Amino acid sequence: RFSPYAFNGGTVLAIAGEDFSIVASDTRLSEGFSIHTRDSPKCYKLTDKTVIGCSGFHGDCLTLTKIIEARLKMYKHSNNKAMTTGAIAAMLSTILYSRRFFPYYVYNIIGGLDEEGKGAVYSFDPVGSYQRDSFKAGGSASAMLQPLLDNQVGFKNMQNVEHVPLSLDRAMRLVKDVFISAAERDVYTGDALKVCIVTKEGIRGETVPLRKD
Amino acid sequence: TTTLAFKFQHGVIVAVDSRASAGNYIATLKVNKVIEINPYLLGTMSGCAADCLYWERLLAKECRLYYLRNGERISVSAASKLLSNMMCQYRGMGLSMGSMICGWDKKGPGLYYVDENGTRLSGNMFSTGSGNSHAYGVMDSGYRPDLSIEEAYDLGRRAIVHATHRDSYSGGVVNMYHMKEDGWVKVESTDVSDLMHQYRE
Amino acid sequence: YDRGVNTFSPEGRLFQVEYAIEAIKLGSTAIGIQTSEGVCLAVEKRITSPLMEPSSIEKIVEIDAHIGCAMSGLIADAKTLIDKARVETQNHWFTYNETMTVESVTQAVSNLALQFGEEDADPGAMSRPFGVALLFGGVDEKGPQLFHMDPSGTFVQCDARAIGSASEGAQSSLQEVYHKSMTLKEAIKSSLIILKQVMEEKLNATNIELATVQPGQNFHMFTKEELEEVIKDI
Amino acid sequence: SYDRAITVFSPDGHLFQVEYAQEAVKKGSTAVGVRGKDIVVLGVEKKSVAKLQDERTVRKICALDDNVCMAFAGLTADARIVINRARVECQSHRLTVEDPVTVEYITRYIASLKQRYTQSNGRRPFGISALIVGFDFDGTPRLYQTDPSGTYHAWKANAIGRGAKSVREFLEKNYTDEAIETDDLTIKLVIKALLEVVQSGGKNIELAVMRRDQPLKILNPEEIEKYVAEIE
Amino acid sequence: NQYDNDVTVWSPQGRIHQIEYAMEAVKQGSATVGLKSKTHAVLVALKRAQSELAAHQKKILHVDNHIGISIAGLTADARLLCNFMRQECLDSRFVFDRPLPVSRLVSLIGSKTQIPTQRYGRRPYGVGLLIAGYDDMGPHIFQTCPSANYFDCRAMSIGARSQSARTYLERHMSEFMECNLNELVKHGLRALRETLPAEQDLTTKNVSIGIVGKDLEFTIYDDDDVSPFLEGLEE
Amino acid sequence: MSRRYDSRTTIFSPEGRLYQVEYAMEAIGHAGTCLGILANDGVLLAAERRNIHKLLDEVFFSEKIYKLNEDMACSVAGITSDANVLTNELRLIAQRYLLQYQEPIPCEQLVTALCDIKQAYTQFGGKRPFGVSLLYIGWDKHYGFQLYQSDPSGNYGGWKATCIGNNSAAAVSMLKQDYKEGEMTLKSALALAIKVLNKTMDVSKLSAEKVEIATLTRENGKTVIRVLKQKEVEQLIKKHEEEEAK
Amino acid sequence: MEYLIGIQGPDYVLVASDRVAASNIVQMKDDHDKMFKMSEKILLLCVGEAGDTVQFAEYIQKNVQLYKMRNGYELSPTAAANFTRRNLADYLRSRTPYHVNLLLAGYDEHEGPALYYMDYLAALAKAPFAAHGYGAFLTLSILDRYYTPTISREKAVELLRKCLEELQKRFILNLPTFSVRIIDRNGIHDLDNISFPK
Amino acid sequence: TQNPMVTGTSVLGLKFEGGVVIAADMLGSYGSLARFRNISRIMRVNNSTMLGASGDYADFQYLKQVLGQMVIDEELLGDGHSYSPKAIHSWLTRAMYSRRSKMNPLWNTMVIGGYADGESFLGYVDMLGVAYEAPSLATGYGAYLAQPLLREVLEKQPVLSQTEARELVERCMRVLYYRDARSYNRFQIATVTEKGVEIEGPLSAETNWDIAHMIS
Amino acid sequence: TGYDLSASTFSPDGRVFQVEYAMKAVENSSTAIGIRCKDGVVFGVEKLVLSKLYEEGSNKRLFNVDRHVGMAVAGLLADARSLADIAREEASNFRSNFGYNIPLKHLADRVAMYVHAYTLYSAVRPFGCSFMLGSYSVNDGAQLYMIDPSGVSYGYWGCAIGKARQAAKTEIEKLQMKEMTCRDVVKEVAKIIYIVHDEVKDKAFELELSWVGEITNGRHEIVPKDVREEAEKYAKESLK
């Protein structure tokens, strides 16, 4: 018959530091065993302080992004100000939920800085539940990324070790290395990398090379 | 997903764990299941995480509209009925939510259980979630209405601690919310694994 | 009577809107004032008989925790807007999970002012414009704010306003006594000093009501026990 | 359907349809009421009794719920509607809120109907002024009045309908705290209040009382006659 | 006297009186002007004060990043058109993923404001507009009316006593093309003062502007941002 | 929509009395005179006939006396046209009651159900009201025999003895004097209704063709609605005519 | 499944029900009261799907209470039975089917005692005694053997205790405690709750 | 559309220096049959953009008719605005998606070529709404066959001329004729440049079958 | 006395006034002409400049309904832009339904019916826009059809709509346009307009012209720069 959803792969990783929030994703867009194109950035920009990733069916990633960017302007025109990171989460929770009967298949991870200037990451589900966390992942490689962060970021399973808040200098190498580890062992990840760092100054996009196979 | 509540002399106590997983893979860990609604009203979370989280927000919206219109500070009994009536018009469409509504009204320490299909039950003791059965055992172990405050929390801890230990879809940290006449107050948030090796000596 | 509701006068103004503002002159005097530390609201109850209970007449309603209100003119027409304003404030808190600013509240109620019409409408459309003028006080991240609304749908930011039976007599003396940084307690006195003279019946604790809102404290209406100390300092 | 503006403004700002609707109340059957301590009393005068009428079907003092009753003065064809619309709201409230209906809650809904029919396309304003009475939880008596415009107030004592002015002139003087101490004098105050609208008559006076949790009780012509026997 | 009360009733002279009376609604409100160079297009609107105590109405509204409007007419009635224009500009970026052409957006207003003039029982929108926008064909200034007839203009003035402001724009027309960002705005600011009597001057409070150009999105300067343009212009 | 052609039927008068309702009552004022009397046993309806000619067939039924339900009936005074619309509505109302509750409709419930239809036309819709005012008879399991009189405004009420139509004011003044509460019997009620009409008839001699009587009694747990044939009607007249002299 | 029962005496209608509210493998609420009071002398007993019982039976309780306020007199137990049917019947073919099982128990000044049976397809039946649930198979047999039209309320409660204590032996579900009420000319009257302290 | 009647076949395209070339078979295919052997599956859209599609052909003439009105209605105003191939691409992405969300999709796969403002736009949409832009595209089994032939050249030579382009297109169409069951020998090569869309006549491929002797 | 208040009423003499009043809306509108020749159809319009502030080309009265169909309107331009948009819906519905070029004879019918539907009711007003439709086809030839506020359609060799008619309709009769070629017609069209145009009330205008015929291969176009300049100068040389 007709199967409306297909899995296009993709991987999203967010880390909320004290002064910074990093949202990174790969470029590979692939349906089935074939690669359509090796540049398809998952990271999309909403406001200056907010970057949203979309991992899932690519047609919903394109539609949902145009719906969000449409309601950013509906808010900015009505309220004469940009949406806060917490407001984008609460809105997109109701946007994803209005599809409850015919859901969007996507994994949204919103990250950036809140009113306090601190890294705020909101990870969603296709049905629109959301909760704040220091680090989240998504997509096919989400299962590989999370255990690595529980150790380095969370200092779990280590007795009598000091807890130092993660530094951006360590965070850059931490995001790059988990993908170098994930792109190897995952077939849906590779061919390039795009890191969008959200600080108080602005968004800085950095591209990293990954295994091409 | 394990959740429980019980009422006694000094009022209600609510206890949940933090874990919510999808399949064999644990999605998140510290997720807070208990939903705050009013100062003196407290909801819970069971079933689909997005469904009960959404519809409980409407109840938080309707309780506000009631208090603004009438100014009568809605009782726990009516707030339980609003959440059921909203879930009854979408019946058959696949909404899965459990829930419990706790609070202190003019009548007393009311506690209710509102379900996906409209089941509305007052009562002394309730538990929901996948590990609900494991909670009733420890709660029925000699809980009495005459327990003091400290003796009551020790039961709330020891119920979830043994509930998540037996259940693989339940775990994380125990969130305990005491209830009083004025409003709820958070007793503690404590890791299960750290309480296990306590009770294990 | 020969002239639809949507007919323009030769002067370029809608009749029914021109007539609606003529109905504000018959209302009750309501005086709002804005202050950097909060907003004060006072209104005359207009008790028509000793047997009437003053506690049942509330002309100052709470739209939300951070937003007050006031009304003049027809009180009946006010309930349609107030019950609509409360829904829009909660719709915002529900969707975007934040308190709707006083600016967006007026844009919600002001959109319903010109919705009146006869043909090409629904069963929920109105045959006449509202005969009520509202004053929304409130506090948001932009500080205390006070707005004005008329039947024409024009919302106007304001430092202070006077509406009801006498706007002219109150607006004349209000612009004078209102100076810059003047705080709440000074504004309350200046509000009553204006209000006590512009009414007819003498000032009593139950004869009029008073409201206020602060950035760190929710919208509050002074009870009779608190008003008896305030009318003592008049 | 028929959508056209009936109620519209005027060069003086007055609503003709709402003012002419209140003119229907200005000739009613006079209805009065007072508030006691634990008791509350309603009364109405009927000049239309030819002794051929059935007094039970013409009673203008009705009951919206167990805890709330009401009267009206105006065009009786319009009262059946509001009442049948109010009684639907009382039961839909107990379905929404397991608690009974507050006296104020049902007075709002009666007022919200008289509003919508003022501004709706191709409608007519109601010609009835309803006087609502009941006991809220904790047992405090409450007396309200509505208006064809949709404006509801509260009252300790009140009168509506034809001759409502002269009745208030008696009520305002003779309503004190030393009064309404006993259930009889509260009833004796209503009958004395109707003396201004007495035609040299009063066998036609209808009364009703409410006390605590007990339901509405209408006095027969015999019970009222005993209260009339004491004057001087 | 019988021909006046209805929109769909013609006259012996073939003139619709209600559409004429809806034109009077534009003359009942604050004057606005705008003009375009080879690059920028700038709207300058005079915010009217109900009193010195009350604040000023907002005469300039965002529509899209590249498009903005200056409303002169019934205030709450212009928010019906602005809400329509914002939906049309979002539907253009949602469908074609391109900025909506300004000559198209004004044509949709001509279709929306035409219907109430045609049908009985409805009133024509009493709001005149100046739509400033930038597209591949260059900046545009479009005037509309209550009659639904829209124009294509180098510079216009609508509102109360707008004829004098139009006369000013005609004399300097030849210079409008080479003006930079600052000088272009000054042309419009000199137009407003001509509309008002000499007893009133231009202030940071009562004057709002907006600017759309090649590399610059439409932006509204409220008060403190209006001062740098106000300074340097002799009155 | 061309308001010019709109007469505004639903608006109030300056004195607060609906025009189309008052003018409907003057249409009923010249219509056929009907009356009713409630006795200890049975209730009757005496309807005068204003259409009489040698060429009229008299094919159907009592001609202005209808039957709403097994337990109830009605007469009509007013426009003969609009009565057929109401009757078809009353017959739907009683049968919708019987559909849900599976019991005969009580008289109080049926009357107040129709007057809601007479309100919708007077309150809104812009359409003209009904020029038909009705009498009602019937029996129910609760309040016993019932006699109700509505109007074009929907204002009804119970009555022991009433009258409607032409010379309805002069008839009621006669009932108030003669009618005794609880002392009336159907045999003494029929003799009463004839004496009332014979004074209010515009044509004397009281022919059996003009006035026709319909009585309602309950026997063996069943309501019996009978229209007296012209034989028995004339018998009651002659018995009343001998009591005027002998 | 939940359990209902009713018995019609000459002057009275004796109804009883189980107080258990159960979900999955556990009993949530043991004191849950399934007896819904439509009017003074009219009760109602509804079991079925957990959500459909309270949702539907509250739509009836309001229509019955509304009728008494409109006309000044309450419905008779006969009219209240045929009204609950048509509502439950009209649902069936619509998009919101109700699954319920009803017992309408009432007393009337004239018709006297009445007891009505109803299934989820809205087929109304008037029986001297009736029961619902899986416990209706183990019970109605006992009612067949000891019931008589002349039974007295002293015997009826004693007869009711014979039936309800046999759900504790054969019937698999717990059902520890049973609510019991009786209706007479003086209205509803509660009776001592049958309780078997396991 | 569950089993579209008269499916198309692979559509090759690849952007070269200052232009875009699109090759498509002329064969309509009903089931496994080759039924309509002369059809134009490459539509000219305005001057500067070029469309050709795959999948259901009945849905291609519907879009041929709609886009015809879209472009013609645009020319009727004469405003000087012409849809850029990115607008034609983003418009189809919505049409494909809105039909999808209604569970009544147009079964089709389209490749939009164009050259505007010195920027060559080659673009791809899909039934489900999946859309992107790539230097080389193919549909159906072209993505499994001629796609690694195009990528293998573009990795070594990212810059191709107009003469090298058509030569590589002729080779890739030659491989499809060999390796694709529903392909056919006659095909159109339509090359859009600044001079405008020019659709070359039906062409063919010189084939070397001489390996048939080696297998023997 | 009240008979003219709505389009639903006949005068006691039988005339519908609200339709006759909509025609006077055209009589005050500017003059536009159109002409047929052997090769094709040519349009001309007097587009009055109300102010120098208006951009050249604004308020364009020549609409393109379809590729092969031109349009010229005289009347209230607000209603004209509605007709031109509705005439496009008919040409596009034709292209969708019948899949080829809409014949001008049929396109001047559907449109003249829509213009007519507003003279019947009392809930609408008649259009105040009179307009002509020319077209050319190799299998048809030069065709010109005028439509008026009442919905009457006639074919013409040449016509004048708007203010000046009898003056312009006499000047066209003198020349014989049947055997002439379009390239020689364009020069005569501009010659007629300047002779017809006299400046008393109004001030200035912008001459607009259109090609449809053999030269354009059936596609309706505005006259190109050089030819429009070539044609306008000839009318100025022939002015005196």
Q: Concatenated DSSP letters for I28-80?
A: TSPPEEEEE-SSEEEEEEEEEE--TTBPTT-S--EEEEETTEEEEEEE-HHHH
* Calpha distance G87→G56 (Å, rounded): 9
Between CA A90 and CA A95, with CA A94 as vertex, the angle to 5 degrees is: 110
Q: I99: exposed, middle or buried (C-beta count within 10 Å: 0-12, 13-18, 19+)?
A: exposed
3-state secondary structure of H86: helix
3-state secondary structure of I155: strand
Q: How far is CA G136 from the centre of its chain?
A: 12
Q: Which residues are paired to B47 by β-bridges?
A: B97
CB A59 within 8 A of CB H130: yes
Q: How many other β-carbons are positioned within 10 Å of the β-carbon of residue C229?
A: 10
Which among A199, A194, A188 is positioned nearest to A10, based on CA atoms? A188
Which among B14, B71, B87 is positioned nearest to B45, based on CA atoms? B14
φ, ψ for residue I46 (rounded to 5)?
Answer: -100, 110
Q: HSE on the CB side for B174, CA within 13 Å?
A: 29
Cβ contacts of F203-211, under 8 Å, gap ≥ 24: F206/F237, F208/F233, F208/F234, F208/F237, F209/F49, F209/F52, F210/F48, F210/F49, F210/F52, F211/F46, F211/F47, F211/F48, F211/F49
* Calpha distance H151→B168 (Å, rounded): 49
Range of the structural domain that residue I52 is part of: 1-240
Which residues of chain C does A79 touch, with a Cβ-Cβ cutoff of 8 Å?
A: 101, 103-104
Convert D63-130 into a string of H (helix), E (strand) and C (coil).
ECCCCEEEEEEECHHHHHHHHHHHHHHHHHHHHHCCCCCCHHHHHHHHHHHHHHHHHECCCCCCCEEE
Report how far apart, in Å, the C-alpha atoms of C60 and of each of C32, C210, E65 are.
11, 8, 41
DSSP B68: H
Which among D112, D124, D19, D21 is positioned nearest to D75, based on CA atoms? D21
Show me where the domains of chain D are located.
16-229
Parallel, antiparallel, or unpaired: how do β-strands G177-184 and G124-126 relate? unpaired
> b or e along H121-157 (b: 16 or more beta carbons within 10 Å of the residue's beta carbon)?
bbbbbbbbbbbbbbbbbbbbbbbebbbebbbebbeee
F2 to chain I, closest Cα gap in Å: 7
* Calpha distance I38→A206 (Å, rounded): 69
N- to C-terminal Cα separation, chain H:
45
* Calpha distance H62→F24 (Å, rounded): 64
CB pairs under 8 A between C and F: 4
Which CATH homologous superfamily contains domain D16-229? Aminohydrolase, N-terminal nucleophile (Ntn) domain (3.60.20.10)
What the block records as the tokens of C231 is 């009318």
Report how far apart, in Å, the C-alpha atoms of E195 and of each of B176, E163, E164, E190 are.
70, 8, 6, 9
> b or e along E217-233 (b: 16 or more beta carbons within 10 Å of the residue's beta carbon)?
ebebbeeeebeebbeee
Cβ contacts of A152-161, under 8 Å, gap ≥ 24: A153/A15
* Calpha distance H159→I121 (Å, rounded): 68
Convert chain F into a string of H (helix), E (strand) and C (coil).
CCHHHCCCCCCCCCCCCCHHHHHHHHHHHCCCCEEEEECCCCEEEEEECCCCCCCCCCCCCCCCEEEEECCEEEEEEECHHHHHHHHHHHHHHHHHHHHHHCCCCCHHHHHHHHHHHHHHHHHCCCCCCCCEEEEEEEEECCCEEEEEECCCCCCCCEECEEEECCCHHHHHHHHHHHCCCCCCCHHHHHHHHHHHHHHHCCCCCCCCCCEEEEEEEEECCEEEEEECCHHHHHHHHHHHHHHHHC
- The answer to whether the Cβ–Cβ distance between I54 and E119 falls below 8 Å is no
* Calpha distance I118→I18 (Å, rounded): 10
CB B114 within 8 A of CB B120: yes
What is the residue-wise DSSP string for E24-72? HHHHTS--EEEEE-SS-EEEEEEPPBSSSSB-B---EEEEETTEEEEEE
* Calpha distance B68→B66 (Å, rounded): 5
Which residues lie closer than 8 Å to I151 by C-beta, 6 or more apart?
Answer: I112, I113, I115, I116, I119
| Residue H20 parent element (H or E) | strand H19-25
Q: Which residues are paired to D124 by β-bridges?
A: none
Which among C120, C145, C117 is positioned nearest to C129, based on CA atoms? C117
CB C68 within 8 A of CB C58: no
Report how far apart, in Å, the C-alpha atoms of B27 and of each of A43, A125, A138, A156, B2 are.
21, 10, 10, 17, 16
Q: Which residues are paired to H132 by β-bridges?
A: H124
* Calpha distance F243→F225 (Å, rounded): 28
* Calpha distance H11→H33 (Å, rounded): 19
Residue of B nearest to A125 (CA): B50
CB D57 within 8 A of CB F158: yes
3-state secondary structure of E142: strand
Active-site residue, H1 included: yes
> b or e along H25-54 (b: 16 or more beta carbons within 10 Å of the residue's beta carbon)?
bbbbbeeeebeeeebebbbbbbbbbbbbbb
Which ranges of chain B does DSSP label H, i.e. alpha helix? 49-69, 76-88, 132-139, 149-166, 192-199
Q: Which residues are paired to D85 by β-bridges?
A: none
* Calpha distance I148→C57 (Å, rounded): 64
**Residue H142 falls in which region: left (phi positive, over 0), alpha (psi -120 to 50) or beta:** alpha
Q: How many other β-carbons are positioned within 10 Å of the β-carbon of residue A211?
A: 10
* Calpha distance E33→E60 (Å, rounded): 11
* Calpha distance E36→E130 (Å, rounded): 12
* Calpha distance D152→D149 (Å, rounded): 9
| Residue E230 parent element (H or E) | helix E227-230
CB D73 within 8 A of CB D31: yes
Q: Is chain I in touch with chain H: ≥3 Cβ pairs within 8 A?
A: yes
Chains within contact range of chain I (3+ C-beta pairs < 8 Å):
E, F, H
- Structure-determination approach: cryo-EM
What the block records as the tokens of A213 is 């196979």
φ, ψ for residue E116 (rounded to 5)?
Answer: -60, -25
Which residues of chain G does D84 touch, with a Cβ-Cβ cutoff of 8 Å?
A: 70
* Calpha distance D15→G192 (Å, rounded): 64
Q: How far is CA D172 from the centre of its chain?
A: 18
Report how far apart, in Å, the C-alpha atoms of B62 and of each of B65, C90, C98 are.
5, 9, 16
Between CA A124 and CA A127, with CA A125 as vertex, the angle to 5 degrees is: 120
* Calpha distance E64→A136 (Å, rounded): 35
What total of structural domains would you count in chain I?
A: 1
Report how far apart, in Å, the C-alpha atoms of C227 and of each of C46, C221, C231, D154 are.
17, 10, 6, 22
Q: Which residues are paired to H119 by β-bridges?
A: H116
DSSP G154: H
What the block records as the tokens of A59 is 């047609």
Which residues lie closer than 8 Å to I165 by C-beta, 6 or more apart?
Answer: I31
Q: Is chain D in touch with chain C: ≥3 Cβ pairs within 8 A?
A: yes
Parallel, antiparallel, or unpaired: how do β-strands G21-23 and G26-29 relate? antiparallel
Cβ contacts of G171-174, under 8 Å, gap ≥ 24: G171/G134, G171/G135, G171/G138, G173/G1, G173/G20, G173/G22, G173/G134, G173/G135, G174/G20, G174/G27, G174/G198
CB C49 within 8 A of CB C39: no
Query: In one letter, which amino acid is E192?
Result: L
Which residues of chain F does G82 touch, with a Cβ-Cβ cutoff of 8 Å?
A: 100-102
Q: Which residues are paired to F25 by β-bridges?
A: none
Cα torsion C20, C26, C28, C29 to 10°: value is 90
Convert E2-16 into a string of H (helix), E (strand) and C (coil).
CCCCCCCCCCCCCCC
What the block records as the tokens of D83 is 């009442």
* Calpha distance B154→H140 (Å, rounded): 66
3-state secondary structure of I23: helix
* Calpha distance C8→A187 (Å, rounded): 70
Restricting to D residues 81-110, those with a Cβ less than 8 Å away from any Cβ of F are: 81, 84
CB H76 within 8 A of CB I66: yes
Helices (H) and strands (E) in chain D, counts: 6, 10
Q: How many other β-carbons are positioned within 10 Å of the β-carbon of residue I148?
A: 22
| Residue C212 parent element (H or E) | strand C208-214
CB H63 within 8 A of CB H92: yes
Which among H125, H64, H60, H117 is positioned nearest to H89, based on CA atoms? H125
Report how far apart, in Å, the C-alpha atoms of E233 and of each of E48, E193, E204, E226, E228 are.
21, 12, 13, 12, 10
Which among E170, E149, E221, E196 is positioned nearest to E32, based on CA atoms? E196
Gaps in chain E (C to N distance exceeding 2.5 A) after: none
The residue whose two tokens read 């009267």 is: D71
The residue whose two tokens read 């990954």 is: A210
CB E23 within 8 A of CB E147: yes
G84 to chain F, closest Cα gap in Å: 9
**Dihedral angle sign, alpha carbons of residues F135, F132, F172, D62:** positive
Which among A91, A95, A107 is positioned nearest to A140, based on CA atoms? A107
Q: What is the resolution of this structure in A?
A: 3.3
* Calpha distance G6→G130 (Å, rounded): 6
Cβ contacts of E186-191, under 8 Å, gap ≥ 24: E186/E229, E186/E232, E186/E233, E187/E35, E187/E155, E188/E33, E188/E34, E188/E35, E188/E42, E188/E43, E188/E44, E189/E44, E189/E229, E189/E230, E189/E233, E190/E233, E191/E33, E191/E44, E191/E157, E191/E165
N- to C-terminal Cα separation, chain C:
50
G73 to chain F, closest Cα gap in Å: 9
CB A11 within 8 A of CB A25: yes
What total of structural domains would you count in chain A?
A: 1
Q: How many other β-carbons are positioned within 10 Å of the β-carbon of residue F186?
A: 17
Biggest alpha carbon distance in chain A?
58
**Residue A157 falls in which region: left (phi positive, over 0), alpha (psi -120 to 50) or beta:** left
CB I172 within 8 A of CB I182: no
Parallel, antiparallel, or unpaired: how do β-strands I221-222 and G194-195 relate? unpaired
What the block records as the tokens of B4 is 């429980």
Which residues of chain H does E94 touch, with a Cβ-Cβ cutoff of 8 Å?
A: 94
CA Rg, chain A, in Å?
Answer: 17
φ, ψ for residue C216 (rounded to 5)?
Answer: -100, 5
Q: Does E62 touch chain A (CB under 8 A)?
A: yes
**CATH of residue F96:** 3.60.20.10
Of the partner residues D97, D104, D105, the one whose CB lies closest to the CB of residue B78? D97
Of the partner residues G24, G29, G51, the one whose CB lies closest to the CB of residue B118? G51
Q: How far is CA E97 from the centre of its chain?
A: 26
D47 to chain F, closest Cα gap in Å: 15
* Calpha distance E132→E211 (Å, rounded): 8
Which among H189, H145, H139 is positioned nearest to H166, based on CA atoms? H189
Between CA D78 and CA F22, with CA F16 as vertex, the angle to 5 degrees is: 80
CB G139 within 8 A of CB G109: no
- Structural domains in chain C plus CATH codes: 8-233 (3.60.20.10)
Which residues of chain F does E121 touch, with a Cβ-Cβ cutoff of 8 Å?
A: 1
Which residues lie closer than 8 Å to I1 by C-beta, 6 or more apart?
Answer: none
- The answer to whether the Cβ–Cβ distance between G69 and D95 falls below 8 Å is no
Query: In one letter, which amino acid is E197?
Result: P
Which among A169, A205, A146, A124 is positioned nearest to A17, based on CA atoms? A169
Residue of C nearest to B68 (CA): C62
Q: Is chain F in touch with chain H: ≥3 Cβ pairs within 8 A?
A: no
CB I122 within 8 A of CB H96: no
Which among E79, A205, I53 is positioned nearest to C113, based on CA atoms? E79
DSSP D155: B
Q: How many other β-carbons are positioned within 10 Å of the β-carbon of residue E32?
A: 30
**Dihedral angle sign, alpha carbons of residues G135, G137, G141, G147:** positive
What the block records as the tokens of H212 is 């048939």
* Calpha distance F115→F118 (Å, rounded): 5
